[PDB]
Amino acid sequence: FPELKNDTFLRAAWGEETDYTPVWCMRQAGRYLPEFRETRAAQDFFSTCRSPEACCELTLQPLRRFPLDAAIIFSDILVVPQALGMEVTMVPGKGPSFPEPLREEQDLERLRDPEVVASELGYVFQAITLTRQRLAGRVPLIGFAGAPWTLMTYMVEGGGSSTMAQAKRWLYQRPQASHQLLRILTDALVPYLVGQVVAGAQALQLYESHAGHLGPQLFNKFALPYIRDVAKQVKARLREAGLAPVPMIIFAKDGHFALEELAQAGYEVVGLDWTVAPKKARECVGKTVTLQGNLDPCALYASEEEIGQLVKQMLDDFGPHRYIANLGHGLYPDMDPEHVGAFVDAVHKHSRLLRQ
Amino acid sequence: FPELKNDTFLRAAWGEETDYTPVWCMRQAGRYLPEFRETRAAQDFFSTCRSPEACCELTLQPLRRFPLDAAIIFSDILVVPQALGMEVTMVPGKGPSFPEPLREEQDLERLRDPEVVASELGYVFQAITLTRQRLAGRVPLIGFAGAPWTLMTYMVEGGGSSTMAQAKRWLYQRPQASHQLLRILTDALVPYLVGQVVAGAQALQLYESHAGHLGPQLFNKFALPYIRDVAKQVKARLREAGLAPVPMIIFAKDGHFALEELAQAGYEVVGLDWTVAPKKARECVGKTVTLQGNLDPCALYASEEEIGQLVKQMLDDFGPHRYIANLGHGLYPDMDPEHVGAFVDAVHKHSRLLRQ
C-alpha cells in the first residue's frame, strides 16, 4: 500500500495541529454529480456496490473534481442487514427498501450468524483495496458502517419513517429481543470494520443517523452501550492483528443530548449536525476530541459568495485546532457541484487566512 | 361564558403554585380513539372541521375518557394556508396535501390578503364558542395555530418531507420572497388567534413543529422574529379589545438550540420534546417561564406499570413548580387509550405523592 502524501485529515483527527483545516462531505460521491448517475446507470444499485471497479470509480469521482482531504468509500449502510440475510428491493426510484421487515421476535431466526457476515461482504473489502491503491497515497480513505441502532430501525421499520414508531415500539415492548438484535448487529459490525481496515481503510466512520428519535434514557440503554462496544472490540481485534488503529468517528445526527458521552465513548472524532451551535459542542465534549461538521447542507443553495461567509463564520466558531470541517448531513441530489467546490475552497482559503 | 371550575392548567401556566401537576396531550383528540374514527367517518376531513358540532364532539371525546386538565380545540394547522387560498386534497389515506405548492416567488400572487382571512375561518370561531359552552367550565380550552415557518414549509414543500429542502432552498435563494411569505403568515395568524380568544379560547398554543430543520442562524433570521410578532401583536390587539390576555405556549419541536430565546420571546410556556433533558431545559430558560412536556410518545407502548415509573422520573426532573406535564409530540394513532389513561393517572398520582 502506497505511502500517504496529504495526511492533514488524519493528523487533524488525532488532535495534532495542522497548517489548514481539512474538509470532506458526507455523500461526496452522490447523485448531485452527473458523472455519478451515468455510472449508476451501469446496473441495479446493489451490484454496483457488488462490483469493485464501480465503487472505486464513484469513490474517486468527487476527488477528481475537488481537493477534498479524504475519500470515503462508496457503499450503502444497508449492505450489513442485507449480508445478514434480509432482502432489499429498489422500489419505483424511491430508494432503500426491505419488503419483509422484522416485526415479531421470532423473525430474528431469519438472520445469519453474525460471524460469517464478514465473508459475505468480500466485494467491499475488495473495493477498498482497489481504491486504496488507486488513490495512490493522495488522501486517506475512510471506511464506514451504520451504527447498531440505526440499522435496527431500517430492519424493523423496513423503509424510512418520520417517527421510528415500529422500532421504538420494540424498545418499549420487547427490550430483550431488542437487546438481542442490537448485539447481533454489533457482532456483525466489528468483523466488518476490522475487515475494512485490514483491506486498506485508514479511518472509520460510524453513522447513527437515527439518534434523534431516542431521548437520553433510551439512548443510554440501547444506543450508547453498542456504539461503545463497536469502538472497543474493533480497537482490540486490530491490536491482536498487529495492525495500527485508525481514527474512529461517531456521527450522531440530532444527538446534541448525547455529545457528552459520545466524547467518552472512545471515538477520536465526533460529528455534528448543523443544529448544535459549535461553541456549545466544544463545551459538551471538552478539549480532547476533535469535532467534525457542521454546515447546513442546504447552505449550498446560496451564492458562492454567501457560502464563503457562512463558512468563515463556522470557522471562527470552531477555532483552529481539533476540527475537521464538513456539512451537517450528506449532500442533497440537486446541489450544484460548483457550489460544493466553493464550499471546499472557502474552508481552505479561510482556515489559512485564519492562522496566518 | 361559564365560570371555570378546575383551572390548575392556567395557574400552572402563569407560574403560580398548584396542589398537583396539570396534564394534557397533543392530539388528545386523535385516531388512537375509536370513537374518533366513527365520527371522522361522518365526512371528508376538512368539512369536519367545517362543522362546529363535529369539532366540539371530537374536542370533548377524550375529556369523557380521562380527567385531562385542558381541552385543545380540534383543528388542523392546514386551515390557515387553506384560508389563504391554497387547495388541499386528501390523497389515498396518507393525509394533508397541497397538490399545487408555492415554488416560485410569483406564486405568492395566488394568496388572499392576510386581513380577510379571519373571516374565512368563522367555522372555527364558532366551534370554539360552542365548545367553551359545553365544557361548561370543567377545564380551560386551548386554541391553536401553527407558527409562520412551519406553515411556510407545508406551503412550499406541499406534503411532509424529511429534509425541508425545497423550503430551505427558499430561505437561502429567496430571502426577500421568504420574508414576504412569512410576514403574510404572521399577519394572517394574529387576527386568527385574537379571533379564537374573542370566540372563547382561554390559552393559545403555537406549533413550530419544523424548528429542527433550521439551525441557530436560520432560526433567528426567519423563525424567531415571527414567533415574536405573533406573541407581541396578539397581546396588543387583545388589550385594545378590552379582553384579558391568555397564556401563550410556544412549542418548538427539536428546538433545543433555541430554548434561550424562546424563553424571552414573550410566551408564558415553552414546550419541550423528549430529546431535551428536563434539567438542561430549566437551565436554558431560567426560572420565570413554565415548561411543558415531555414524555416520549412511544413511551405509551410500555406496560402501564412501566409508564408510571418513567412518569415518576420525569416529575423528579422537572420538580414541583412552573411545569405542565405533556408528551414530547402528539399521540400516535395506534396507541392504546388505556395507556393514555395510565399516563394521565400517573401524573396526578405522582405529582401529589411528590408534594405531600
Swiss-Prot record, chains A, B:
Effect of H210P: In HEP; mild form
Sites annotated Transition state stabilizer: D76
EC number, as in UniProt: 4.1.1.37
Binding site for coproporphyrinogen III: R27, A29, R31, D76, Y154, S209, H329
Activity at various pH: Optimum pH is 6.8.
InterPro entries to which the protein is assigned, alphabetical: UROD/MetE-like_sf, Uroporphyrinogen_deCO2ase_HemE, Uroporphyrinogen_deCOase
Effect of E157K: In HEP and FPCT; nearly normal activity
GO biological process: heme A biosynthetic process; heme B biosynthetic process; heme biosynthetic process; heme O biosynthetic process; porphyrin-containing compound catabolic process; porphyrin-containing compound metabolic process; protoporphyrinogen IX biosynthetic process
Binding site for coproporphyrinogen I: R27, A29, R31, R40, D76, Y154, S209, H329
Impact reported for R134P: In FPCT; decrease of activity
PANTHER family: METHYLTETRAHYDROFOLATE:HOMOCYSTEINE METHYLTRANSFERASE RELATED, UROPORPHYRINOGEN DECARBOXYLASE
Family: Belongs to the uroporphyrinogen decarboxylase family.
Name of the molecule in the record: Uroporphyrinogen decarboxylase
Organism: Homo sapiens (Human)
Classification lineage: Eukaryota, Metazoa, Chordata, Craniata, Vertebrata
